[PDB]
Amino acid sequence: VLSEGEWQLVLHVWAKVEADVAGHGQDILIRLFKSHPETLEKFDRFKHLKTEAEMKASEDLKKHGVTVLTALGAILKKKGHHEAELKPLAQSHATKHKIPIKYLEFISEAIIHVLHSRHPGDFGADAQGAMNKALELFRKDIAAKYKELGYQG
Ligand code: HEM
């Protein structure tokens, strides 16, 4: 679990991300779709995007970007009791979109990759440590509802 002090740095650096939701939303995705071209093939609305130029112009991504990073916001505030924000996401993620838990790893890798970029003196080590927990945790709760519907895979 995250201790009081552990959620506090998380909730802290996310208070910063709050500041600007969509540009953040931006990079993260470009960092999924770059490092793991496999992810891209999931998004039926985004695969025309060959290059990374194409991929920053496109305004339909940005606003997917906020969509995603809102869903993550709410889950976080609910620190550690989020088991009611999660259920919609776990459901469609398995059944509609047919996503691997391992792409929820790739994504989780890309987030942190980018709050080290856009967030020094709060996203140092100790923040990076709790942050990775609380996503670690995000996927465990996700992964376990997957088992349930039978897509631990
Ligand atoms: C922090 C990770 C993620 C979160 C919170 C997230 C959140 C959501 C939200 C709220 C939407 C719209 C509502 C819905 O369709 O259920 C969405 C759509 C979708 N998610 Fe995610 N998603 C996540 C991770 C992933 C991962 C990494 C992939 C792919 C490798 C993925 C692929 C999809 C797909 C393809 C859609 C359908 C897009 C469309 O046609 O509108 N998601 N997800």
PDB file of C-alpha atoms and ligand atoms in Angstrom:
ATOM      1  CA  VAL A   1       0.000   0.000   0.000  1.00  0.00           C
ATOM      2  CA  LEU A   2       1.042   3.616  -0.187  1.00  0.00           C
ATOM      3  CA  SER A   3       1.690   5.218   3.119  1.00  0.00           C
ATOM      4  CA  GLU A   4       0.385   8.636   3.882  1.00  0.00           C
ATOM      5  CA  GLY A   5       3.759  10.080   2.867  1.00  0.00           C
ATOM      6  CA  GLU A   6       3.829   7.961  -0.335  1.00  0.00           C
ATOM      7  CA  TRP A   7       0.441   9.122  -1.674  1.00  0.00           C
ATOM      8  CA  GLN A   8       1.322  12.679  -0.759  1.00  0.00           C
ATOM      9  CA  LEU A   9       4.159  12.922  -3.267  1.00  0.00           C
ATOM     10  CA  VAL A  10       2.032  11.250  -5.817  1.00  0.00           C
ATOM     11  CA  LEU A  11      -0.987  13.411  -5.216  1.00  0.00           C
ATOM     12  CA  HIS A  12       1.523  16.325  -5.212  1.00  0.00           C
ATOM     13  CA  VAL A  13       3.174  15.833  -8.602  1.00  0.00           C
ATOM     14  CA  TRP A  14      -0.238  15.146 -10.102  1.00  0.00           C
ATOM     15  CA  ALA A  15      -1.468  18.517  -8.736  1.00  0.00           C
ATOM     16  CA  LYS A  16       1.339  19.841 -10.982  1.00  0.00           C
ATOM     17  CA  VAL A  17       0.103  17.692 -14.020  1.00  0.00           C
ATOM     18  CA  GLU A  18      -3.369  19.039 -13.355  1.00  0.00           C
ATOM     19  CA  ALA A  19      -1.856  22.411 -14.256  1.00  0.00           C
ATOM     20  CA  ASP A  20      -1.717  21.391 -17.918  1.00  0.00           C
ATOM     21  CA  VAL A  21      -3.612  18.104 -18.682  1.00  0.00           C
ATOM     22  CA  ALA A  22      -3.460  17.738 -22.431  1.00  0.00           C
ATOM     23  CA  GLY A  23       0.121  18.347 -23.413  1.00  0.00           C
ATOM     24  CA  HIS A  24       1.098  15.851 -20.822  1.00  0.00           C
ATOM     25  CA  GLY A  25      -1.678  13.727 -22.292  1.00  0.00           C
ATOM     26  CA  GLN A  26       0.136  14.237 -25.617  1.00  0.00           C
ATOM     27  CA  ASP A  27       3.744  13.172 -25.035  1.00  0.00           C
ATOM     28  CA  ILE A  28       2.777  10.031 -23.146  1.00  0.00           C
ATOM     29  CA  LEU A  29       0.862   8.581 -25.987  1.00  0.00           C
ATOM     30  CA  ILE A  30       3.522   9.557 -28.587  1.00  0.00           C
ATOM     31  CA  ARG A  31       5.862   7.697 -26.248  1.00  0.00           C
ATOM     32  CA  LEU A  32       3.635   4.598 -26.281  1.00  0.00           C
ATOM     33  CA  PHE A  33       3.136   4.673 -29.991  1.00  0.00           C
ATOM     34  CA  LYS A  34       6.794   5.268 -30.665  1.00  0.00           C
ATOM     35  CA  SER A  35       8.406   2.686 -28.346  1.00  0.00           C
ATOM     36  CA  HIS A  36       5.848  -0.027 -28.918  1.00  0.00           C
ATOM     37  CA  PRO A  37       4.307   0.364 -32.476  1.00  0.00           C
ATOM     38  CA  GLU A  38       2.236  -2.587 -31.372  1.00  0.00           C
ATOM     39  CA  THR A  39       0.231  -0.351 -29.084  1.00  0.00           C
ATOM     40  CA  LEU A  40      -0.702   1.836 -32.057  1.00  0.00           C
ATOM     41  CA  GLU A  41      -2.390  -1.018 -33.884  1.00  0.00           C
ATOM     42  CA  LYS A  42      -4.991  -1.053 -30.988  1.00  0.00           C
ATOM     43  CA  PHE A  43      -6.119   2.506 -31.844  1.00  0.00           C
ATOM     44  CA  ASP A  44      -8.239   2.250 -35.044  1.00  0.00           C
ATOM     45  CA  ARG A  45      -8.470   6.096 -35.006  1.00  0.00           C
ATOM     46  CA  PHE A  46      -4.729   6.759 -34.775  1.00  0.00           C
ATOM     47  CA  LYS A  47      -2.871   4.297 -37.019  1.00  0.00           C
ATOM     48  CA  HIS A  48      -2.914   6.541 -40.078  1.00  0.00           C
ATOM     49  CA  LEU A  49      -0.385   8.479 -37.945  1.00  0.00           C
ATOM     50  CA  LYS A  50       2.850   7.036 -39.512  1.00  0.00           C
ATOM     51  CA  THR A  51       5.422   9.634 -38.420  1.00  0.00           C
ATOM     52  CA  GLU A  52       5.621  11.591 -35.195  1.00  0.00           C
ATOM     53  CA  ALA A  53       5.098  14.904 -36.999  1.00  0.00           C
ATOM     54  CA  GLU A  54       1.689  13.525 -38.149  1.00  0.00           C
ATOM     55  CA  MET A  55       1.134  12.583 -34.601  1.00  0.00           C
ATOM     56  CA  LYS A  56       1.528  15.983 -32.900  1.00  0.00           C
ATOM     57  CA  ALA A  57      -0.576  17.946 -35.457  1.00  0.00           C
ATOM     58  CA  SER A  58      -3.555  15.522 -35.020  1.00  0.00           C
ATOM     59  CA  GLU A  59      -5.951  17.153 -32.554  1.00  0.00           C
ATOM     60  CA  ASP A  60      -8.002  13.987 -32.087  1.00  0.00           C
ATOM     61  CA  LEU A  61      -5.143  12.398 -30.118  1.00  0.00           C
ATOM     62  CA  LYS A  62      -4.742  15.392 -27.778  1.00  0.00           C
ATOM     63  CA  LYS A  63      -8.312  15.009 -26.756  1.00  0.00           C
ATOM     64  CA  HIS A  64      -7.967  11.318 -26.333  1.00  0.00           C
ATOM     65  CA  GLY A  65      -4.960  12.329 -24.266  1.00  0.00           C
ATOM     66  CA  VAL A  66      -7.020  14.307 -21.809  1.00  0.00           C
ATOM     67  CA  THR A  67      -9.625  11.544 -21.792  1.00  0.00           C
ATOM     68  CA  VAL A  68      -7.013   9.009 -20.584  1.00  0.00           C
ATOM     69  CA  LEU A  69      -5.359  11.367 -18.092  1.00  0.00           C
ATOM     70  CA  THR A  70      -8.608  12.299 -16.500  1.00  0.00           C
ATOM     71  CA  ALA A  71      -9.473   8.659 -15.907  1.00  0.00           C
ATOM     72  CA  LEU A  72      -6.054   8.263 -14.245  1.00  0.00           C
ATOM     73  CA  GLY A  73      -6.485  11.435 -12.220  1.00  0.00           C
ATOM     74  CA  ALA A  74      -9.719  10.229 -10.472  1.00  0.00           C
ATOM     75  CA  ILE A  75      -8.342   6.815  -9.758  1.00  0.00           C
ATOM     76  CA  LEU A  76      -5.391   8.526  -8.032  1.00  0.00           C
ATOM     77  CA  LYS A  77      -7.343  10.921  -5.702  1.00  0.00           C
ATOM     78  CA  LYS A  78      -9.205   7.806  -4.626  1.00  0.00           C
ATOM     79  CA  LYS A  79      -5.856   6.611  -3.432  1.00  0.00           C
ATOM     80  CA  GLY A  80      -5.997   2.948  -2.761  1.00  0.00           C
ATOM     81  CA  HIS A  81      -9.733   2.801  -2.618  1.00  0.00           C
ATOM     82  CA  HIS A  82     -10.384   3.254  -6.374  1.00  0.00           C
ATOM     83  CA  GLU A  83     -12.160   0.014  -6.868  1.00  0.00           C
ATOM     84  CA  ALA A  84     -15.248   1.759  -8.345  1.00  0.00           C
ATOM     85  CA  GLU A  85     -13.497   4.056 -10.868  1.00  0.00           C
ATOM     86  CA  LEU A  86     -11.541   1.025 -11.998  1.00  0.00           C
ATOM     87  CA  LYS A  87     -14.358  -1.313 -13.014  1.00  0.00           C
ATOM     88  CA  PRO A  88     -15.496   0.485 -16.300  1.00  0.00           C
ATOM     89  CA  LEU A  89     -11.852   0.640 -17.380  1.00  0.00           C
ATOM     90  CA  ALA A  90     -10.956  -2.964 -16.526  1.00  0.00           C
ATOM     91  CA  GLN A  91     -14.232  -4.167 -18.277  1.00  0.00           C
ATOM     92  CA  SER A  92     -13.861  -2.399 -21.683  1.00  0.00           C
ATOM     93  CA  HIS A  93     -10.127  -2.728 -21.576  1.00  0.00           C
ATOM     94  CA  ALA A  94     -10.504  -6.519 -21.551  1.00  0.00           C
ATOM     95  CA  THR A  95     -13.603  -6.939 -23.496  1.00  0.00           C
ATOM     96  CA  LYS A  96     -14.017  -4.102 -25.949  1.00  0.00           C
ATOM     97  CA  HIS A  97     -10.559  -2.987 -26.764  1.00  0.00           C
ATOM     98  CA  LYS A  98      -8.886  -6.280 -25.988  1.00  0.00           C
ATOM     99  CA  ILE A  99      -5.807  -4.839 -24.321  1.00  0.00           C
ATOM    100  CA  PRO A 100      -2.917  -6.807 -22.773  1.00  0.00           C
ATOM    101  CA  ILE A 101      -1.961  -5.853 -19.169  1.00  0.00           C
ATOM    102  CA  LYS A 102       1.458  -5.599 -20.582  1.00  0.00           C
ATOM    103  CA  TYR A 103       0.446  -2.529 -22.681  1.00  0.00           C
ATOM    104  CA  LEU A 104      -0.771  -1.171 -19.378  1.00  0.00           C
ATOM    105  CA  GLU A 105       2.756  -1.603 -18.499  1.00  0.00           C
ATOM    106  CA  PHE A 106       4.213   0.102 -21.560  1.00  0.00           C
ATOM    107  CA  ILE A 107       1.846   2.985 -20.845  1.00  0.00           C
ATOM    108  CA  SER A 108       2.898   3.100 -17.244  1.00  0.00           C
ATOM    109  CA  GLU A 109       6.466   3.179 -18.381  1.00  0.00           C
ATOM    110  CA  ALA A 110       5.698   6.167 -20.754  1.00  0.00           C
ATOM    111  CA  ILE A 111       3.882   8.280 -18.044  1.00  0.00           C
ATOM    112  CA  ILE A 112       6.889   8.201 -15.615  1.00  0.00           C
ATOM    113  CA  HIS A 113       9.230   8.630 -18.500  1.00  0.00           C
ATOM    114  CA  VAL A 114       7.497  11.978 -19.011  1.00  0.00           C
ATOM    115  CA  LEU A 115       7.009  13.284 -15.530  1.00  0.00           C
ATOM    116  CA  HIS A 116      10.811  13.022 -15.159  1.00  0.00           C
ATOM    117  CA  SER A 117      10.904  15.213 -18.296  1.00  0.00           C
ATOM    118  CA  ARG A 118       8.347  17.785 -17.387  1.00  0.00           C
ATOM    119  CA  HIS A 119       8.818  17.761 -13.561  1.00  0.00           C
ATOM    120  CA  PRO A 120      12.357  17.767 -11.872  1.00  0.00           C
ATOM    121  CA  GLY A 121      12.290  19.041  -8.280  1.00  0.00           C
ATOM    122  CA  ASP A 122       9.096  17.164  -7.428  1.00  0.00           C
ATOM    123  CA  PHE A 123       9.477  14.107  -9.611  1.00  0.00           C
ATOM    124  CA  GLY A 124      12.874  13.238  -8.199  1.00  0.00           C
ATOM    125  CA  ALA A 125      13.683   9.765  -6.851  1.00  0.00           C
ATOM    126  CA  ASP A 126      11.272   9.498  -3.842  1.00  0.00           C
ATOM    127  CA  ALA A 127       8.358  10.681  -5.995  1.00  0.00           C
ATOM    128  CA  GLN A 128       9.365   8.370  -8.783  1.00  0.00           C
ATOM    129  CA  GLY A 129       9.264   5.577  -6.207  1.00  0.00           C
ATOM    130  CA  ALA A 130       5.704   6.053  -4.897  1.00  0.00           C
ATOM    131  CA  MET A 131       4.401   7.047  -8.322  1.00  0.00           C
ATOM    132  CA  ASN A 132       5.653   3.674  -9.683  1.00  0.00           C
ATOM    133  CA  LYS A 133       3.952   1.949  -6.802  1.00  0.00           C
ATOM    134  CA  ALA A 134       0.624   3.566  -7.367  1.00  0.00           C
ATOM    135  CA  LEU A 135       0.626   2.499 -11.019  1.00  0.00           C
ATOM    136  CA  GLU A 136       2.067  -0.845 -10.054  1.00  0.00           C
ATOM    137  CA  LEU A 137      -1.024  -1.022  -8.026  1.00  0.00           C
ATOM    138  CA  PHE A 138      -3.235   0.368 -10.790  1.00  0.00           C
ATOM    139  CA  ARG A 139      -2.279  -2.575 -12.923  1.00  0.00           C
ATOM    140  CA  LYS A 140      -2.652  -5.155 -10.189  1.00  0.00           C
ATOM    141  CA  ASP A 141      -6.173  -4.092  -9.496  1.00  0.00           C
ATOM    142  CA  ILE A 142      -6.795  -3.947 -13.235  1.00  0.00           C
ATOM    143  CA  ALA A 143      -5.107  -7.323 -13.905  1.00  0.00           C
ATOM    144  CA  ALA A 144      -7.211  -9.024 -11.227  1.00  0.00           C
ATOM    145  CA  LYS A 145     -10.579  -7.964 -12.654  1.00  0.00           C
ATOM    146  CA  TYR A 146      -9.212  -9.316 -15.956  1.00  0.00           C
ATOM    147  CA  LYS A 147      -8.788 -12.790 -14.441  1.00  0.00           C
ATOM    148  CA  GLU A 148     -12.453 -12.538 -13.341  1.00  0.00           C
ATOM    149  CA  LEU A 149     -13.790 -11.882 -16.859  1.00  0.00           C
ATOM    150  CA  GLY A 150     -11.102 -14.291 -18.039  1.00  0.00           C
ATOM    151  CA  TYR A 151      -8.545 -12.280 -20.007  1.00  0.00           C
ATOM    152  CA  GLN A 152      -5.467 -12.541 -17.725  1.00  0.00           C
ATOM    153  CA  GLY A 153      -3.507 -12.262 -20.898  1.00  0.00           C
TER     154      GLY A 153
HETATM  155  C1  HEM B   1      -3.181   4.608 -18.064  1.00  0.00           C
HETATM  156  C2  HEM B   1      -3.736   3.644 -19.221  1.00  0.00           C
HETATM  157  C3  HEM B   1      -5.125   3.693 -19.787  1.00  0.00           C
HETATM  158  C4  HEM B   1      -6.199   4.324 -19.354  1.00  0.00           C
HETATM  159  C5  HEM B   1      -6.584   4.978 -18.068  1.00  0.00           C
HETATM  160  C6  HEM B   1      -7.212   4.345 -20.538  1.00  0.00           C
HETATM  161  C7  HEM B   1      -8.477   5.027 -20.396  1.00  0.00           C
HETATM  162  C8  HEM B   1      -9.441   4.943 -21.408  1.00  0.00           C
HETATM  163  C9  HEM B   1     -10.594   5.957 -21.604  1.00  0.00           C
HETATM  164  C10 HEM B   1     -11.395   6.621 -20.537  1.00  0.00           C
HETATM  165  C11 HEM B   1     -10.982   5.759 -22.918  1.00  0.00           C
HETATM  166  C12 HEM B   1     -12.383   6.005 -23.335  1.00  0.00           C
HETATM  167  C13 HEM B   1     -13.451   5.177 -22.609  1.00  0.00           C
HETATM  168  C14 HEM B   1     -13.382   3.716 -23.015  1.00  0.00           C
HETATM  169  O1  HEM B   1     -13.230   3.525 -24.220  1.00  0.00           O
HETATM  170  O2  HEM B   1     -13.389   2.800 -22.162  1.00  0.00           O
HETATM  171  C15 HEM B   1     -10.148   4.804 -23.537  1.00  0.00           C
HETATM  172  C16 HEM B   1     -10.316   4.269 -24.869  1.00  0.00           C
HETATM  173  C17 HEM B   1      -9.472   3.238 -25.354  1.00  0.00           C
HETATM  174  N1  HEM B   1      -8.293   2.678 -24.650  1.00  0.00           N
HETATM  175 FE1  HEM B   1      -7.534   3.290 -23.062  1.00  0.00          FE
HETATM  176  N2  HEM B   1      -6.708   3.563 -21.587  1.00  0.00           N
HETATM  177  C18 HEM B   1      -5.552   3.122 -21.052  1.00  0.00           C
HETATM  178  C19 HEM B   1      -4.669   2.361 -21.527  1.00  0.00           C
HETATM  179  C20 HEM B   1      -4.754   1.854 -22.710  1.00  0.00           C
HETATM  180  C21 HEM B   1      -3.667   1.198 -23.371  1.00  0.00           C
HETATM  181  C22 HEM B   1      -2.205   1.435 -23.286  1.00  0.00           C
HETATM  182  C23 HEM B   1      -4.094   1.018 -24.557  1.00  0.00           C
HETATM  183  C24 HEM B   1      -3.369   0.545 -25.721  1.00  0.00           C
HETATM  184  C25 HEM B   1      -2.036  -0.096 -25.992  1.00  0.00           C
HETATM  185  C26 HEM B   1      -5.450   1.526 -24.654  1.00  0.00           C
HETATM  186  C27 HEM B   1      -6.272   1.501 -25.757  1.00  0.00           C
HETATM  187  C28 HEM B   1      -7.597   1.935 -25.703  1.00  0.00           C
HETATM  188  C29 HEM B   1      -8.352   1.919 -26.852  1.00  0.00           C
HETATM  189  C30 HEM B   1      -7.920   1.472 -28.198  1.00  0.00           C
HETATM  190  C31 HEM B   1      -9.495   2.699 -26.699  1.00  0.00           C
HETATM  191  C32 HEM B   1     -10.484   2.819 -27.801  1.00  0.00           C
HETATM  192  C33 HEM B   1     -10.267   4.188 -28.496  1.00  0.00           C
HETATM  193  C34 HEM B   1     -11.475   4.599 -29.315  1.00  0.00           C
HETATM  194  O3  HEM B   1     -11.705   4.019 -30.428  1.00  0.00           O
HETATM  195  O4  HEM B   1     -12.173   5.516 -28.836  1.00  0.00           O
HETATM  196  N3  HEM B   1      -5.839   2.125 -23.444  1.00  0.00           N
HETATM  197  N4  HEM B   1      -9.191   4.221 -22.582  1.00  0.00           N
END
